């Protein structure tokens, strides 16, 4: 264990394999500036109630 | 495709596909294995072997 509130370690894990990232293209810039239904530059958050 | 009778170098093809490359994009993965389990069974036989 309890560092200040308790944690359940008992072992420890981490993401090992990693995506190397791509970079910019202007075709992708137009694609995500066009607010499609499948993808768009925002994403909403909602209440839990 | 259908193939003609002329040919160029595979290094030339590598250069042209390096020019025309649109490789770095994430694909949809899917599933490698659908269906159900497979019956792998064996029973005990008394007079078989030891």
UniProtKB/TrEMBL annotation, chain A:
Domain of life (superkingdom): Viruses
Compartments it resides in: Virion
Function: Outer capsid protein involved in mRNA capping. Catalyzes the last 3 enzymatic activities for formation of the 5' cap structure on the viral plus-strand transcripts, namely the RNA guanylyltransferase, RNA-7N- and RNA-2'O-methyltransferase activities.
Protein name in the entry: Lambda-2 protein
Gene name of the encoded protein: L2
Region of the whole protein represented: 2 to 50 of 1289
């Amino acid at each position: 264990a309890n560092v200040w509130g308790v944690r359940l370690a008992d072992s420890l894990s981490s993401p090992t394999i990693e995506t190397r990232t791509r970079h910019y293209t202007l075709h992708d810039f137009y694609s995500d500036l066009d607010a499609s239904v499948g993808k768009e530059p925002w994403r909403p958050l909602r209440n839990q109630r | 495709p259908q193939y003609t009778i002329d040919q160029v170098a595979v290094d030339e093809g590598d250069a042209m596909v390096s020019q025309l490359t649109q490789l770095p994009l994430r694909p949809d993965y899917g599933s490698i294995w659908i269906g159900e389990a497979l019956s792998y069974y064996v029973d005990y036989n008394r007079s078989h072997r030891v």
